Design an enzyme around this catalytic site. Structure first.
Site, PDB file in Angstrom:
ATOM      1  N   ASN B 161       3.293   3.803  -0.387  1.00 49.54           N
ATOM      2  CA  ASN B 161       2.480   2.811  -1.075  1.00 49.54           C
ATOM      3  C   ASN B 161       1.007   3.196  -1.044  1.00 49.54           C
ATOM      4  O   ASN B 161       0.562   3.924  -0.152  1.00 49.54           O
ATOM      5  CB  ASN B 161       2.671   1.442  -0.431  1.00 49.54           C
ATOM      6  CG  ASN B 161       4.001   0.815  -0.784  1.00 49.54           C
ATOM      7  OD1 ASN B 161       4.409   0.810  -1.945  1.00 49.54           O
ATOM      8  ND2 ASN B 161       4.688   0.283   0.219  1.00 49.54           N
ATOM      9  N   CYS B 182      10.986   1.924  -6.146  1.00 41.29           N
ATOM     10  CA  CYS B 182      11.077   0.748  -5.286  1.00 41.29           C
ATOM     11  C   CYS B 182      12.278  -0.093  -5.715  1.00 41.29           C
ATOM     12  O   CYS B 182      12.518  -0.274  -6.910  1.00 41.29           O
ATOM     13  CB  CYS B 182       9.803  -0.092  -5.351  1.00 41.29           C
ATOM     14  SG  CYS B 182       9.933  -1.421  -4.132  1.00 41.29           S
ATOM     15  N   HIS B 183      13.019  -0.620  -4.746  1.00 40.16           N
ATOM     16  CA  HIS B 183      14.257  -1.339  -5.043  1.00 40.16           C
ATOM     17  C   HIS B 183      14.091  -2.854  -4.914  1.00 40.16           C
ATOM     18  O   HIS B 183      15.034  -3.560  -4.556  1.00 40.16           O
ATOM     19  CB  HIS B 183      15.380  -0.857  -4.118  1.00 40.16           C
ATOM     20  CG  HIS B 183      16.757  -1.139  -4.634  1.00 40.16           C
ATOM     21  ND1 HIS B 183      17.078  -1.080  -5.973  1.00 40.16           N
ATOM     22  CD2 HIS B 183      17.900  -1.471  -3.989  1.00 40.16           C
ATOM     23  CE1 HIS B 183      18.357  -1.369  -6.131  1.00 40.16           C
ATOM     24  NE2 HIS B 183      18.879  -1.611  -4.942  1.00 40.16           N
ATOM     25  N   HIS B 211       6.201  -4.584  -7.383  1.00 36.75           N
ATOM     26  CA  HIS B 211       5.995  -5.828  -6.641  1.00 36.75           C
ATOM     27  C   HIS B 211       5.440  -6.921  -7.547  1.00 36.75           C
ATOM     28  O   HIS B 211       4.743  -7.833  -7.092  1.00 36.75           O
ATOM     29  CB  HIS B 211       5.074  -5.616  -5.437  1.00 36.75           C
ATOM     30  CG  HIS B 211       5.602  -4.635  -4.436  1.00 36.75           C
ATOM     31  ND1 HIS B 211       4.914  -4.297  -3.290  1.00 36.75           N
ATOM     32  CD2 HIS B 211       6.755  -3.929  -4.403  1.00 36.75           C
ATOM     33  CE1 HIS B 211       5.619  -3.419  -2.600  1.00 36.75           C
ATOM     34  NE2 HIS B 211       6.741  -3.178  -3.254  1.00 36.75           N
ATOM     35  N   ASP B 268       9.607  -8.575  -3.784  1.00 38.84           N
ATOM     36  CA  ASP B 268       8.281  -8.701  -3.191  1.00 38.84           C
ATOM     37  C   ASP B 268       7.325  -9.490  -4.072  1.00 38.84           C
ATOM     38  O   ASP B 268       6.275  -9.926  -3.590  1.00 38.84           O
ATOM     39  CB  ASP B 268       7.698  -7.315  -2.909  1.00 38.84           C
ATOM     40  CG  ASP B 268       8.445  -6.578  -1.814  1.00 38.84           C
ATOM     41  OD1 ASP B 268       8.904  -7.232  -0.854  1.00 38.84           O
ATOM     42  OD2 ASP B 268       8.572  -5.340  -1.914  1.00 38.84           O
TER      43      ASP B 268
HETATM   44  N1  LIG Z   1       8.714   2.174  -2.179  1.00 40.81           N
HETATM   45  C1  LIG Z   1       9.415   1.291  -1.256  1.00 40.81           C
HETATM   46  O1  LIG Z   1      10.497   0.890  -1.528  1.00 40.81           O
HETATM   47  C2  LIG Z   1       8.743   0.887   0.063  1.00 40.81           C
HETATM   48  C3  LIG Z   1       7.447   1.531   0.465  1.00 40.81           C
HETATM   49  N2  LIG Z   1       7.255   1.974   1.818  1.00 40.81           N
HETATM   50  C4  LIG Z   1       6.256   3.038   2.095  1.00 40.81           C
HETATM   51  O2  LIG Z   1       6.841   4.136   2.491  1.00 40.81           O
HETATM   52  C5  LIG Z   1       5.792   4.896   3.465  1.00 40.81           C
HETATM   53  C6  LIG Z   1       6.514   5.255   4.750  1.00 40.81           C
HETATM   54  O3  LIG Z   1       6.882   4.057   5.399  1.00 40.81           O
HETATM   55  P1  LIG Z   1       7.422   4.147   6.962  1.00 40.81           P
HETATM   56  O4  LIG Z   1       8.640   5.033   6.979  1.00 40.81           O
HETATM   57  O5  LIG Z   1       7.777   2.766   7.464  1.00 40.81           O
HETATM   58  O6  LIG Z   1       6.246   4.786   7.940  1.00 40.81           O
HETATM   59  P2  LIG Z   1       6.502   6.058   8.973  1.00 40.81           P
HETATM   60  O7  LIG Z   1       5.270   6.270   9.822  1.00 40.81           O
HETATM   61  O8  LIG Z   1       7.690   5.784   9.863  1.00 40.81           O
HETATM   62  O9  LIG Z   1       6.802   7.407   8.063  1.00 40.81           O
HETATM   63  C7  LIG Z   1       5.696   8.149   7.611  1.00 40.81           C
HETATM   64  C8  LIG Z   1       5.932   9.648   7.952  1.00 40.81           C
HETATM   65  O10 LIG Z   1       5.161  10.373   7.191  1.00 40.81           O
HETATM   66  C9  LIG Z   1       4.523  11.472   8.182  1.00 40.81           C
HETATM   67  N3  LIG Z   1       3.489  12.242   7.505  1.00 40.81           N
HETATM   68  C10 LIG Z   1       2.302  11.668   7.737  1.00 40.81           C
HETATM   69  N4  LIG Z   1       1.360  12.392   7.113  1.00 40.81           N
HETATM   70  C11 LIG Z   1       1.965  13.414   6.492  1.00 40.81           C
HETATM   71  C12 LIG Z   1       1.493  14.452   5.714  1.00 40.81           C
HETATM   72  N5  LIG Z   1       0.215  14.928   5.206  1.00 40.81           N
HETATM   73  N6  LIG Z   1       2.345  15.338   5.220  1.00 40.81           N
HETATM   74  C13 LIG Z   1       3.670  15.226   5.478  1.00 40.81           C
HETATM   75  N7  LIG Z   1       4.132  14.216   6.236  1.00 40.81           N
HETATM   76  C14 LIG Z   1       3.274  13.314   6.738  1.00 40.81           C
HETATM   77  C15 LIG Z   1       4.213  10.778   9.248  1.00 40.81           C
HETATM   78  O11 LIG Z   1       4.011  11.675  10.428  1.00 40.81           O
HETATM   79  C16 LIG Z   1       5.497   9.939   9.408  1.00 40.81           C
HETATM   80  O12 LIG Z   1       6.445  10.647  10.072  1.00 40.81           O
HETATM   81  C17 LIG Z   1       4.811   4.067   3.717  1.00 40.81           C
HETATM   82  O13 LIG Z   1       3.599   4.448   2.932  1.00 40.81           O
HETATM   83  C18 LIG Z   1       5.315   2.682   3.259  1.00 40.81           C
HETATM   84  O14 LIG Z   1       4.284   1.912   2.827  1.00 40.81           O
HETATM   85  C19 LIG Z   1       8.054   1.370   2.880  1.00 40.81           C
HETATM   86  C20 LIG Z   1       9.192   0.371   2.522  1.00 40.81           C
HETATM   87  C21 LIG Z   1       9.451  -0.022   1.049  1.00 40.81           C
END
Ligand SMILES: NC(=O)C1=CN([C@@H]2O[C@H](COP(=O)(O)OP(=O)(O)OC[C@H]3O[C@@H](n4cnc5c(N)ncnc54)[C@H](O)[C@@H]3O)[C@@H](O)[C@H]2O)C=CC1
Ligand SMILES: NC(=O)C1=CN([C@@H]2O[C@H](COP(=O)(O)OP(=O)(O)OC[C@H]3O[C@@H](n4cnc5c(N)ncnc54)[C@H](O)[C@@H]3O)[C@@H](O)[C@H]2O)C=CC1
Lengths: 469, 469
Positions: B161, B182-183, B211, B268
């Protein structure tokens, strides 16, 4: 004959301006030109009619003045219909400014500085009334419908506010031949004077919405002239001083908006800024000078008081000419009854262009029709146009408005217009509430309900109340 | 070969979902399918890689897993690039949620409930970061540029996001082949369950922005099914009770928005309402139930704490399989390592449609291109599309979104996207300030400066600070 009808002709100083210009226009100052003065206030109507005829006689013009209390009589067969009327409930008020001042106090009573009708990019006093401007929209739509049936070829020259909302609603909902008028563009001429530029040497253009126009082109001697404004801001803005509450074109607010948007806001647009410049009176005085502008709790009521006194003075003046028919209005009051020089407003030049092919460049509120391609064709914009015998012809807006003007200013203002129109046609108080839910001054939903309840409960809002019930 | 690269594969539970789906997809579970897992956190990366391979083996799938700390290696020659990365400053944090929680507290310290990133029609926690989402936009644009040169035919499947802002910026500024995922549409299925309707018998459609989607078509047995929702609101809403902080689809907030807009907000979108439902925690609990939703000072930090614990648990679990290679992950933790049943997310179905012509109906963030004719062609919308071997094909949105959705919801949200993009590309703090000048919680300009100063001064925002200097 040539029938020019003034709806709300009790707006005497503006009526006399219209009359004076018509009498001093060669092609219109004819025995075949009939000026119909129509108003619901008998005292003001008569006073305007007496002063108008005495004024015409001193100008040695053969136009005939007709007064009437019938809106239908004024509209019937009219060639041009000028709507400068400001409705009011006669059981409680004498003019329209009263209902806006009173509701504004109720708004401030509930924590809405300068009333709920004062909103971001919409601070001009008396522009909207309870958001949807019910009495003003109602009258305009009534005239439009009566006009389509009784004067199919006429032009409805809308001057009563809100010009943007009204002109849009009439165009969209009735297809009547309405055009919105406002001379806010005139602010450009103070810019040129402050920068020591001969206006005739300046290649300039403005465009936007009503009270939301921008100096999109400003060139001098084959170059962009804005660097000359940059110099003025750096060397002369620190010493700027307003001459009166209305003086804001070269204010810190105007230049701060120029720095962000890239083009200078013109005219009332400087008044229609974000809340950054209008949180309170102290903030207004920092950004507009000692008076704090015109849209504050001190200057707005003071200005409206001057208008009331001016109305009575002109009423009593009409009694004087009847008693002393030998006096010369042009001599004893040359300002109120000019002679020789035209006013400079766009209403009569517009009439002289449509009727007598006297082509002129004007700034009028008309449908976009692709002029600002990023906006819908049907949205009413304030655009540079050339008017002649056969239609209105929009200039090309070049340079185009900046990206920031579109996304931070024009679009938010266009959406508010749509909010207000939705609030009117839907008759749904929930739409009014939603508008205040987007208001920064709202602290709770219960606050919204309470301020609207007290406004709707005012005696002179009985009609408005039944409308939204 | 088929190269599917997961950027940010330390998002273990989501990585394993992607892996599990690929392994349980007949056409993709091949020795010619290479899954590249890339992340900047060595501990999380390794843990994900170990759990992924053990998971694949138990599923008896021949796909090979490759881990790398090089973004270039993962992007090189990739067929699909899934960006689920959440940047963070490793000198001060271990994950991305930390920087958003901390700045949110600074925001609330200065009178911005739930932080400056919480705005009207934009309450989803962790969606934007300091309005412009600098670290997240920066990474996405970096991948896009590297991708145009190293993987010209690949798809960038953006999940991090803000999906709306990022997908729009990448499309507009790089022309990279990005699609936002996004689902949130899945909320419709709870509506059908609550109304006792077989989903297979419901002819439905949704559309809007990320959203910000609406159930524009809802029909059942050849008739409009919304009267069935009207009945539910009248007979079953008074007894509605949320099962958990995330349960809001059938909440009083959702139905109040339905009453005003005419179509039910989905997913959302119910969280992204006006400030009417979010002034404070008490207000949230009135409109979302006992939990007050998920985007409040109690549930948001609690949820982020659960995520941290879940990360460590899975890390330690990766140490367990190395010590006990005989264990069956699918047996001892069937939820985290499903078997047989697919997850239901759209990422792998999308890949299987592009690569193997397995045509499917999905809801993806793509350019409007006339689908919602009242909006610009290039604005990224969340639309119903059919994906196959040769492109993405937008369905016709019928019925069209209501007038109120467009003027009161979609357009204000689209403008905010434009505000945020302008704030990023301009590198101009004045754009950030202007956004907060439109914020209802702002009481003064000096407040805006102070909250931004403290945010920019946080140690982990050194890069952001230099960007806007
Ligand atoms: N599109 C959707 O359906 C939804 C959106 N999201 C988004 O998905 C993203 C991830 O969410 P989470 O898994 O909960 O957080 P998370 O912290 O568990 O996963 C993020 C990963 O990306 C890594 N990473 C960080 N910087 C990096 C870089 N330059 N290059 C490569 N890898 C890198 C981090 O070390 C971490 O392991 C978030 O931005 C969140 O907002 C989350 C749920 C619903
Ligand atoms: N377009 C522009 O350039 C500007 C807009 N205005 C607008 O022009 C309008 C008039 O302004 P003022 O002259 O200062 O107020 P005013 O009170 O002096 O004039 C309004 C006149 O309209 C009369 N009238 C009221 N209801 C009527 C009805 N149903 N039918 C016929 N006549 C009716 C009133 O009795 C009154 O005589 C206002 O709405 C004001 O907001 C004023 C200045 C700049």
């Amino acid at each position: 004959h040539m029938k020019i009808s003034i709806i709300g002709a009790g707006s005497v100083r503006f009526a006399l301006q219209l009359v004076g210009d018509i009498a001093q226009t060669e092609e219109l100052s004819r025995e075949d030109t009939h000026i119909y003065m129509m108003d619901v206030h008998e005292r003001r109507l008569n006073a305007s009619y007496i002063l108008a005829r005495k004024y015409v006689e001193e100008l040695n013009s053969p136009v005939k003045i007709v007064k009437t209390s019938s809106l239908d009589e004024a509209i019937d067969g009219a060639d041009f219909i000028i709507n400068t009327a400001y409705p009011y409930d006669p059981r409680y008020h004498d003019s329209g400014s009263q209902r806006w001042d009173e509701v504004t106090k109720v708004g401030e009573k509930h924590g809405y500085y300068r009333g709920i009708d004062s909103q971001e990019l919409n601070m001009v006093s008396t522009y909207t009334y309870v958001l949807s401007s019910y009495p003003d929209m109602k009258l305009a739509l009534e005239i439009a419908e009566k006009m389509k049936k009784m004067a199919p070829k006429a032009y409805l020259m809308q001057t009563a506010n809100p010009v943007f909302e009204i002109t849009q609603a009439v165009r969209r909902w009735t297809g009547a031949n309405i055009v919105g008028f406002c001379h806010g563009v005139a602010g450009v001429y103070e810019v040129f004077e402050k920068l020591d530029l001969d206006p005739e040497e300046v290649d300039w253009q403005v465009a936007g919405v009503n009270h939301g126009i921008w100096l999109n082109r400003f060139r001098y001697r084959g170059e962009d002239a804005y660097p000359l404004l940059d110099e003025w801001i750096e060397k002369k803005l620190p010493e700027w001083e307003p001459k009166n509450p209305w003086d804001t074109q070269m204010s810190p607010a105007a230049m701060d908006m120029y720095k962000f948007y890239g083009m200078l806001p013109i005219g009332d647009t400087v008044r229609n800024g974000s809340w950054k410049y209008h949180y309170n009176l102290e903030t207004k005085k920092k950004w507009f000078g000692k008076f704090g502008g015109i849209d504050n709790e001190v200057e707005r009521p003071k200005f409206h008081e001057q208008l009331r006194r001016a109305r009575e003075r002109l009423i009593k003046l009409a009694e004087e000419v009847q008693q002393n028919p030998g006096m010369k209005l042009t001599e004893e009051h040359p300002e109120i009854f000019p002679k020789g020089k035209l006013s400079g407003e766009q209403h009569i030049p517009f009439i002289n262009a449509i009727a007598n092919n006297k082509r002129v460049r004007l700034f009028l509120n008309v449908e976009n029709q692709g002029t600002l391609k990023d906006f819908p064709d049907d949205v009413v914009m304030e655009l540079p146009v050339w008017v002649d015998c056969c239609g209105i012809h929009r200039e090309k807006v070049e340079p185009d408005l900046t990206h920031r003007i579109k996304i931070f200013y024009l679009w938010p203002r266009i959406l508010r217009m749509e909010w207000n129109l939705e609030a009117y046609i839907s008759r749904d108080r929930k739409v009014l509430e939603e508008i205040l839910i987007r208001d920064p001054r709202t602290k709770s939903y219960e606050q919204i309900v309470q301020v609207l309840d007290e406004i709707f409960n005012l005696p002179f809002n009985e009609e408005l109340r039944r409308y939204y019930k």
